[PDB]
Structure 1
Amino acid sequence: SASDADVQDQVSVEGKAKSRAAILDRPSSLNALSAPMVGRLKRLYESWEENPAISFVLMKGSGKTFCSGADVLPLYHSINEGNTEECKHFFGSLYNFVYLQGTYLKPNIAIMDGVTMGCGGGISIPGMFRVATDKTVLAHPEVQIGFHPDAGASYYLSRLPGYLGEYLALTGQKLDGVEMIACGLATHFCLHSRLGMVEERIGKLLTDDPTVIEASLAQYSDLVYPDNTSVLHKIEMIDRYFGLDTVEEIIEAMENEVADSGNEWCKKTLKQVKEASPLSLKITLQSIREGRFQTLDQCLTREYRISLCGVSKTVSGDFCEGIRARLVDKDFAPKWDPPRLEDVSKDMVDCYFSPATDADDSESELKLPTAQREPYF
C-alpha cells in the first residue's frame, strides 16, 4: 500500500556487500519504538536470517539518540479508551523481537551512538556484538515512570557482577560507554568521530566468521580504561547495601549510613530511590533477583506477565499516572497508588507473577517459538 511509506521511513535499510543495517529514524519521538516499527523490524530480521546471501546484520540509529525506549503514549491513550488489546499486541511483538535478537543465527552488531533507554537496550544487548561510543548513555528509568525494566532487562542486569543490576534497576543510574565496556554490556568501543571508519570497514567484510568480525572491530576500535570516578569503583557499596533481602532494608541501611557517615553518594542514591513508585520498586527487585537463575524465554515470559498485569490496572494505576505526569501534564510530580513502601503487600506483588494461564485464558501468556528456534543462548 501507500500508507506504510511512513513506517519504511521510520525503519530504513542500508545494504552492503553481504550485510544489512536497520536504522531507526523517528526523530520526533527520539527513535521511540511503536508497534509498526517493531513489526517491520521483525519482518526484516526474519527475512535477513532466512537469506543465505547475507552474512551478518546491523542496527543503527539516526540522530543524537540511539533508542529512547518504547513509545508509551499510544499505549496510554489505548488504555484510556478501555480496551487493553493494543498494549498486549505491542508487548508480545516487542518481546518476540527481543527473543529473536537473543537467539539469532547470524552475527548481529548494534551501534549505540547516543541515549539508550528501556527496551532500546533490550533489542541490542542480547546481540552478539555491541559497539559503544563517547555519546552512549545507558539508563533504566522504568521505576520512576511506574513500570518495570522489561524486554529482557531482567536477563542482562541480573547477570552483571555483584548486585549492580539491582542498583541500576532501582535508581535508574546512567552508564557511560567506558563503564558499559567494564560491565561487559558492550563488546567494543570507538569514538563518535571514528564511526565512519569502523562502518566502512564492517560494511565490506565478506566473512561469516564471528572471529573475523570481532578481530576487525577490535582492530578499528579504541582502547579505553574506566576513570577513577566511575561507578565500578564503588561496587563494594552496591554489594553491601543493595544486597539486602528487601527494598525497605536497603533504604533503612542507606538512611542509617546517611545519618552516621553523611555519605554524599548515599544522599544522591536516596534522592534517586525516593522518586520511584513503591510498587514497581518491589516488583523490580523481585524480577531482577528471579531472573538470575533462569533462561531468556522464561525471563521474557514473566516480564510479559508483569507488563500485562500493569496495563490492566489490576492493583494500581501507577503506569497511567506516571505516563501522564511525566509525559502529558509535565508537572513531574506523580502521586502513586501506594504513597509509601509499607502499604505494598506480598499479595499485591504476587499478582504480577501469577500464572495467568491458569485463569482459563490463552492470550494472557507469551507465545515463543522455542521448538523452531531451539534456544541456545
Structure 2
Amino acid sequence: TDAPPVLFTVQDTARVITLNRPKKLNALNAEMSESMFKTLNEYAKSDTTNLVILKSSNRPRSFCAGGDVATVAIFNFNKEFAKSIKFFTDEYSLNFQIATYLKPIVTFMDGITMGGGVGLSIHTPFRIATENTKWAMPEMDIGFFPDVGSTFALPRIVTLANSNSQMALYLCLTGEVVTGADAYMLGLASHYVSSENLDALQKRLGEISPPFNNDPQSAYFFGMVNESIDEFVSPLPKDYVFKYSNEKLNVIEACFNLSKNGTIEDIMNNLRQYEGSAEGKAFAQEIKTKLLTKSPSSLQIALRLVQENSRDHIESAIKRDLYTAANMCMNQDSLVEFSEATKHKLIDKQRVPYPWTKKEQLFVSQLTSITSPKPSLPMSLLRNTSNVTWTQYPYHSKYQLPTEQEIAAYIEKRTNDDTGAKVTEREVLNHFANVIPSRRGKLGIQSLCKIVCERKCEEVNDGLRWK
C-alpha cells in the first residue's frame, strides 16, 4: 500500500533502479539495501539484462544524502546492536556487489551524493555527475568513519594531489563538499552530463546491446557504454574555473603527506608549520580550523583506514569497514562518540558541533582493535554472484580522467626513450586527448594535463622534467 522504498523498472534491455525516499533525501536503510542487493543478484543471472542504471526519483534535489545512520543511533541508545549490525552488513555487502558487478552499472549522481550515496557511485566505473552534483563525506562531524569502501576508492581514483592519498585524506578528514564540474575534474565522477540530457541518455543506454557473440560482461561492451555516455557530454561552462588552485593543491599535497605510521598530529603540525604563498598559508589555517572541529577519534580512525585500505584488496577493505562500524556502535572501550554525536546532529537539529570528550591520541594497538574483528562478534558480508577480489578497479581508469601518476609515467617513459627526444607540454596534451582510444576527446582532459605540468613538471629548453 505504501510506496516501495526502491522502485525497479525495465528500460528495454536496461534495468533501472530508482531510490524512492524523497522525504529522507533517498537515505539508505536496511530495507532498501537488502532489496537492491537481492534484485542485483537476479539481474546478474539474467541473460536479457545488459546494464543497470542506479538513479533517484528526487533529482535534482538529491540522489542519496547518505546511509540512514540516525536510525542506527537510536539502535545504539536502545542496545539494539543486532539491528545496527544488520544495517551495515546489508549496506556494505551492496557496496561490495556493485564494485565487483560484472555488468556495467551507470549511476546518475543528479543531486546530493553524500555518504552512502558515494558508495553507490564510487564503486562504478560509470558514475555520471551533473551541475547539481554535491559530493561530500561528512562523517567526521557525526563521529563515524569514511565507510562504503571510500578508503579503498578515493586513494585510487582521485586525479590531483593524490600521489600519497593526500587529496583522499583531505576530503575524508575535512568533509569538504565538491560540486559538479569540480567532482568530474577530481576523479569523483567519470563523466559530466547536463541534467537535461539524462532522459535521452537513459533511453540510449537501454537501446545499446552487445554485438554478435559478445556478452554484456565483455570489455567490448564496457567500451560501448562509455562511448554512448560521451555522445551526451557537453563542453564545460565557459566561466568555469577549477575549485582548487595550484597553490591550494600544494598545501594539500604537502600537509597531508604522511608515512606508513603517520598520525593526525603530523598533519596538524604541517598545517601549523606551513610556509609559502599567502594564499597557501591562509589555506592551511582554514584546514586546521576545520580539522579541529571534528571528532578527535574519527580523524585518527579515518587516517588508519586510509593507510590500511590503500594497499589491500577490495574484499578486505570492505570487510574492515564492517568490523569498524560494528566496533563503533558497540563502544566497548568508550573510545568513540558516534552514537552521541549522531543524535546531536541528526536526531536533534543542532548547528553547533558536538562537544567532544574523547580527545586523546589512540595508540596503534587501540586503533588496531577498533578496526579488527572481535572473536565474539562474527560478522560476514553477504555473498554475491561474482565472489571475486582484486587490488585495482578493473575499469575505473579507462573511463575517467587520467591521474597525476599516469601522466608522470608517460613523461618518464618518453623522456627515457631511445628516441632521445624532448617531452613538450603540447605533446603531452596530444598523447592524452587524441591517442588513447577510451580517452579520445574526453571533456576537460587538456585542462587537467596543463594543471599537472604547470605544478609538477619543470620546463627546461623544449623539454619537460618531473620535478
TM over 0.5: yes
1:148–1:280 CA contact under 8 A, matched in 2: yes
1:219 aligns with 2:231: yes
Distance in 1 (alpha carbons) for counterparts of 2:206 and 2:224: 13
Q: How does 1:243-322 map to 2 (within 5 A)?
A: 243-244=257-258, 245-257=262-274, 263-316=281-334, 317-322=336-341
SS across alignment from 1:131: strand
Deviation at 1:18, TM superposition (A): 0.3
Which one of the candidate residues 99, 105, 109 is aligned to 2:96? 99
SS across alignment from 2:362: coil
Once superposed, what is the RMSD of the aligned Cα atoms? 2.3
Report how many aligned residue pairs link the two structures.
366
Distance in 1 (alpha carbons) for counterparts of 2:380 and 2:119: 17
1:336 is matched with which residue? 356
Which one of the candidate residues 69, 73, 76 is aligned to 2:70? 73
Larger radius of gyration: 2
Give 1:319's aligned amino acid: F
1:198–1:221 CA contact under 8 A, matched in 2: no
Deviation at 1:129, TM superposition (A): 1.0
1:58 is matched with which residue? 53
1:279–1:349 CA contact under 8 A, matched in 2: no
Give 1:121's aligned amino acid: V
2:141–2:295 CA contact under 8 A, matched in 1: yes
Q: For each residue in 1:174-211, what CA deviation from the matched residue of structure 2 results, as whole angstroms up to 9, or x when unmatched?
A: 12232222222322111122222222222322333122
2:369 is matched with which residue? 351
1:190 is matched with which residue? 193
Q: For each residue in 1:232-276, what CA deviation from the matched residue of structure 2 results, as whole angstroms up to 9, or x when unmatched?
A: 633222110011332112112212338995733223212321221
Distance in 1 (alpha carbons) for counterparts of 2:309 and 2:128: 25
Distance 1:372 1:44, change over 3 A: closer
1:189–1:223 CA contact under 8 A, matched in 2: no
Give 2:284's aligned amino acid: C
Distance in 1 (alpha carbons) for counterparts of 2:28 and 2:135: 16
Distance 1:12 1:185, change over 3 A: same
Q: For each residue in 1:302-335, what CA deviation from the matched residue of structure 2 results, as whole angstroms up to 9, or x when unmatched?
A: 1111111100012335111111111123233312
SS across alignment from 1:367: coil
Give 1:219's aligned amino acid: E
Distance in 1 (alpha carbons) for counterparts of 2:56 and 2:196: 15
1:136–1:176 CA contact under 8 A, matched in 2: yes
2:380 is matched with which residue? 366
Which one of the candidate residues 296, 299, 323 is aligned to 2:342? 323
Deviation at 1:355, TM superposition (A): 3.8
Q: For each residue in 1:268-312, what CA deviation from the matched residue of structure 2 results, as whole angstroms up to 9, or x when unmatched?
A: 212321221001100100101111111110101111111111000
Which has the larger displacement, 108-117 or 223-232? Answer: 223-232
Distance in 2 (alpha carbons) for counterparts of 1:55 and 1:235: 40
2:128–2:190 CA contact under 8 A, matched in 1: yes
Which one of the candidate residues 16, 26, 29 is aligned to 1:21? 16
Give 2:355's aligned amino acid: K
Distance 1:269 1:119, change over 3 A: same
2:33 is matched with which residue? 38
Distance in 1 (alpha carbons) for counterparts of 2:243 and 2:278: 21
